[PDB]
Write an enzyme that holds these catalytic residues in place. Structure first.
Site, short mmCIF file in Angstrom:
data_model
loop_
_atom_site.label_atom_id
_atom_site.label_comp_id
_atom_site.label_asym_id
_atom_site.label_seq_id
_atom_site.Cartn_x
_atom_site.Cartn_y
_atom_site.Cartn_z
N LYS A 6 -118.07 -69.41 32.09
CA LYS A 6 -116.63 -69.21 31.85
C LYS A 6 -115.56 -69.84 31.62
O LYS A 6 -114.53 -69.86 30.70
CB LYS A 6 -116.57 -68.53 33.46
CG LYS A 6 -114.95 -68.74 33.77
CD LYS A 6 -114.02 -67.76 32.80
CE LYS A 6 -112.56 -67.67 33.49
NZ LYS A 6 -112.28 -67.76 34.95
N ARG A 61 -107.37 -65.95 58.92
CA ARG A 61 -107.63 -67.39 58.09
C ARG A 61 -107.82 -69.04 57.99
O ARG A 61 -108.39 -69.72 58.23
CB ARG A 61 -105.60 -67.35 57.43
CG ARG A 61 -105.31 -67.51 59.61
CD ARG A 61 -103.29 -68.33 59.00
NE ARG A 61 -103.26 -69.72 58.09
CZ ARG A 61 -102.11 -70.09 58.34
NH1 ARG A 61 -101.29 -69.48 58.67
NH2 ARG A 61 -102.31 -71.13 57.18
N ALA A 101 -104.39 -74.42 46.72
CA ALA A 101 -105.34 -73.60 47.29
C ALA A 101 -104.32 -73.15 48.37
O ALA A 101 -103.82 -74.11 49.03
CB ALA A 101 -106.79 -74.23 47.36
N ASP A 144 -91.75 -69.18 45.83
CA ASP A 144 -91.21 -68.57 46.45
C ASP A 144 -88.91 -68.40 46.62
O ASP A 144 -88.70 -67.79 46.21
CB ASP A 144 -90.91 -68.16 48.09
CG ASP A 144 -92.58 -67.94 48.11
OD1 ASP A 144 -92.55 -66.92 47.15
OD2 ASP A 144 -93.00 -68.12 48.96
N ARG A 171 -87.84 -67.80 42.97
CA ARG A 171 -87.46 -66.64 42.97
C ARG A 171 -86.59 -65.89 44.14
O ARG A 171 -85.66 -65.22 43.66
CB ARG A 171 -88.79 -65.81 43.36
CG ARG A 171 -88.65 -64.50 43.16
CD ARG A 171 -88.61 -63.07 41.57
NE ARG A 171 -87.27 -62.98 41.47
CZ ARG A 171 -86.23 -62.44 40.91
NH1 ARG A 171 -86.73 -62.77 39.35
NH2 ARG A 171 -85.48 -61.83 40.82
N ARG A 187 -78.76 -71.26 37.22
CA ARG A 187 -78.64 -72.92 37.13
C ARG A 187 -78.05 -73.11 38.62
O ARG A 187 -78.20 -73.96 39.00
CB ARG A 187 -78.69 -73.20 37.03
CG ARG A 187 -79.74 -73.66 35.57
CD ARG A 187 -79.94 -74.15 34.12
NE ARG A 187 -78.95 -72.63 33.17
CZ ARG A 187 -78.61 -72.88 32.08
NH1 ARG A 187 -78.63 -73.52 31.52
NH2 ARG A 187 -78.15 -71.81 31.58
N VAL A 212 -76.67 -71.43 40.89
CA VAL A 212 -77.41 -70.65 42.44
C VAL A 212 -78.03 -71.68 42.99
O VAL A 212 -79.69 -72.50 42.88
CB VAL A 212 -78.20 -69.50 42.40
CG1 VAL A 212 -78.71 -69.07 43.56
CG2 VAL A 212 -76.91 -68.39 41.88
N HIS A 223 -95.13 -72.47 54.03
CA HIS A 223 -95.88 -71.63 52.74
C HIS A 223 -96.42 -69.66 53.60
O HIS A 223 -97.93 -70.69 53.79
CB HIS A 223 -96.11 -71.91 51.89
CG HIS A 223 -96.19 -70.36 50.17
ND1 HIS A 223 -95.68 -69.66 50.13
CD2 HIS A 223 -97.92 -70.28 50.15
CE1 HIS A 223 -96.18 -68.86 49.49
NE2 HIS A 223 -97.71 -69.51 49.01
N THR A 259 -103.09 -62.64 43.17
CA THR A 259 -101.54 -63.12 42.44
C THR A 259 -101.92 -64.18 41.90
O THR A 259 -102.32 -64.74 42.40
CB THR A 259 -100.82 -63.03 43.63
OG1 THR A 259 -100.77 -63.08 45.11
CG2 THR A 259 -98.93 -62.36 44.21
#
Lengths: 308, 316, 305, 305
Positions: free
Chosen positions: C37, C82, C113, C142, C145, C159, C161, C169, C223
């Site tokens: 791969k 988790r 990771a 995050d 975005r 820019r 903002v 996270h 994602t």
């Protein structure tokens, strides 16, 4: 990537601005007899840095060329409207020497880029004066006109300029000429493009070249001098060198047989990188075009003989 | 600049991402039979926009092609061992038909960019099925291999790729060919270059063309599929169209006499812009390369006639 | 600028593609248990190079990290708990850090990771490297975005903002509304001047930003484009020595009253790792949010080792 | 995106060059008393186009402003009395704005001629245009150079350095130190944690930014690259409808306690002019500075008429 600019006039100054807006080089040292002008230019140019990539700009001295990778010589007194070009060359030779000697003595071992007119002649003078290898001394040659030429063909034919391949060779000036026979658009010869597209008149192409060749004369007539174009092409050449690009540009290179010419700098395609000229391309010329190249070189050669 | 991407698979998805990162196009509608995947891909790609120029990316249906400027078809059925290349075309035609018709119904009147394989065959198919003008339907053809071909020559000769002119033409695939006679470096022929620079060996050059041409094969054998190279090529073409560049690219264009060929799409340098093919360049060829072209084109025409014949009669 | 990529999954693959298209780094060695791969991935990617700036890509081995400037760790398998996710990734993390460290690699670590904050703390402990040479993607994505969405809603170039999402996270991360500003004007003050902007819209916005990954996974199964791009930007800031401010996973030595754990907050990063950790003044409530986020994390960190 | 530059002096000429290199706008018509110069300048600039994005540059007449999207005024002489300079530039301005408006121009005015703030108010009065459709370069360049210098000093990427030099562009402009910040942390707070950065070096830095233009004029005779580059960026924010935040010369309607004058302050600008005038929180002393600059400005503005 340290550049030392010699000549802070209209061309040198615009050239540094172009380098600043285009983000080429990391350090620029401006040298000119008039120190104060360059100190101001440096501060002013530096005030524009917040809008481009970083750079260090300062008024410099020939000694600062010690660690410079590229020295750009623009400083070249213009011919008086009533004197021998030989004189123009004799006065620029003195100007020249006063620049090369002190720059060499600094320990500088990078590439020389001569832009002072007449450039082909002054590139030979710089080489001869510096004793630097043939490939470390370059002239802007006919790179600016070739670029404009390609751009104009592109506009006429309506094909992206990047796919328009054409060259203007010889001594940059009145005797320079276009290699129509070899010029092509995306792999198709201009000749075949016309045969296939009659609307692209042969006479209009011819005038276009003329307009590209005489433009500098026209600009000097209206504005008194020419600089934006030359300054941009000078920047591009500078970029290819500093970024070890291996780009093909119509520069003033040292003839050693190519086209049969010998011991002179003239304009022809050449590969240029961080170490100067890598290759000097010999484009297949029509015998007619070979004459053109011939005339151009002999006229240039004579002046070169006399001057020295 | 509105784009409708059909097929949100590896290629399709990679393409959208390329468009996003490279800043090409203002709007991208993603279409695939699998709706949830396109919706998640839309949201995911939109989280990348803050690191690039703005764009409106969302999940779409064919009807959204109504006011689109470009429709990219990457939807294609893979060739599983044991089936005629004829079957591979038969099922891909079915698929293509399920895409072309509805898009044409929306009123879409922009340009078609076909990337499915076999691309030349699927391009002519899209053209015939849609009824669109020959110049408004293009295939990605051999653009990727040519770009990769040039960069490699560049690396070998150590000259900026921008000054390396070389074309790989014919049917994209096992029978495509390099026009060595015409390829040149800054205006100087490869032959002439090898004469002045003997270090540049001819076997390595020809092996390199083979490594280029066979690269897609090796990629699939090791990883299962190919998408980054073509996806990036597709975005470049998309940019050439959307930004009305009049760029020269070896694309899948309709042959109307060029190379002595007629009525098929095949790879050759062409000028493309917002209105599609503007010019088809006829690069001088060697009698053999010309024959290669004729052969590559005859086999081509054979598979179309077979696939369309079966599809015209057996469809219910 | 040599980068070693550990993990050639959806994220690692996209990461490299982002690096290729964006022209970041001159060399990428891809390292994954699946040699084929990584091999085919290196060839596919290299075919994309003629359209971008040049780069050298190839299937590598941990030992190739000897002279590497940057090591990005994306490795890790995505119904799991988790806690038991952390455990299977600490083990995987160990099999990666050790050999990379033994190659002589004395560069920077960029962990992606998940959970990042926890696993970033793990890399630090597993490598011994200085608290500033081990960096986590944190909340940079995050926040990026989050800022973009405020910009669209507010209609002012992003820019200008300024906003931050801090803490671990994930589920417990929070927005610093109090300090967040547009051109220098607090969000609060901007809203007064412009009532068209609603707190319900602003509040739900952060929530959408925060749980976006959850939906993308539900819809697409995973994602990768978002974090890939964000990692690429972080990679650039490091490789090009930008001294840029990004909400990264940084070691806590007192800031916000936290200690001995990595967590998300604005920091200056350059070629030599984190240069500075910035302390933004918080609101009591905001301090709680940070507090609660850290205690929840610290416990999981405590039980993991 | 068409532009009409009025004034082909060192500033306008350089402005046009920047616009060409940075590839901003698709059409530039150069209007100046001396036609031949604008004619040979357009040819010269057009020879640079092959190295940049395409554009249509030409010698123009005020009449060509008819369909223009933006007009940039740089005309205006460089001993001198503050009063006399204003009074003759007010005249020049009148011989330009009037004819431009007569053409039919319904776009935006960008005033660069000094003293910029006063000449901007004059443009608004003379043009009759909306307050938001008349803009002055204000302190955008000085603020830009100010931020860049703070960044080199603190060694943090300039994009994360937020500072504002406000007031009338000139000897009376001042830095809003209280509000200035780095990545969200205050200059004051930043200094505290970084002893080596002294409030002494910082005050001298601002003063250098402020009086730099003056040093450049003595050394070189004129200043143009800094202002030209800055003009091109403002032009970009307008032509590309960016909604960018720049300290521009804007009409004061109560903000800061000022009324009926153009003065330097952070603002959002776009394709349709000024969207918002930002009111940054000023200290008592910083507030006094604003009043002083404005009242003095107002004085010279009255006598002028």
């Amino acid at each position: 990537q340290k550049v030392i600019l010699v000549g802070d006039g209209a061309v040198g100054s615009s050239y540094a601005y172009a380098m600043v807006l285009q983000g080429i080089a990391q350090e620029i040292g401006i040298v000119d007899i008039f120190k104060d002008k360059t100190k101001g230019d440096a501060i002013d140019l530096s005030n524009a840095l917040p809008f481009t990539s970083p750079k260090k700009i300062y008024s410099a001295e020939y000694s600062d060329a010690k660690d410079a990778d590229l020295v750009v010589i623009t400083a070249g007194a213009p011919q008086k409207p009533g004197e021998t070009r030989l004189d123009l060359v004799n006065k620029n030779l003195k100007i020249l020497k006063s620049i090369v000697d002190p720059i060499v003595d600094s320990g500088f071992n990078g590439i020389f880029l001569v832009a002072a007119n007449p450039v082909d002649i002054l590139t030979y003078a710089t080489w001869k004066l510096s004793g630097f290898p043939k490939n470390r001394v370059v002239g802007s040659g006919t790179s600016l006109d070739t670029a404009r030429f390609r751009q104009s063909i592109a506009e006429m034919v309506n094909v992206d300029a990047r796919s328009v391949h054409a060259y203007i060779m010889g001594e940059h000036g009145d005797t320079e000429f276009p290699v129509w026979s070899h010029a092509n658009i995306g792999g198709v010869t201009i000749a075949e493009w016309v045969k296939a597209h009659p609307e692209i008149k042969e006479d209009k192409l011819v005038k276009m070249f003329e307009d590209v060749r005489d433009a500098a004369y026209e600009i000097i007539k209206l504005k008194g001098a020419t600089f934006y174009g030359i300054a941009t092409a000078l920047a591009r050449i500078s970029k290819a060198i500093l970024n070890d690009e291996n780009a093909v540009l119509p520069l003033s290179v040292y003839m050693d047989g190519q086209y049969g010419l010998n011991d002179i700098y003239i304009g022809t395609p050449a590969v240029i990188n961080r170490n100067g000229i890598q290759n000097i391309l010999e484009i297949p010329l029509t015998d007619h075009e070979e004459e053109s190249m011939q005339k151009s070189a002999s006229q240039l050669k004579k002046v070169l003989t006399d001057a020295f």
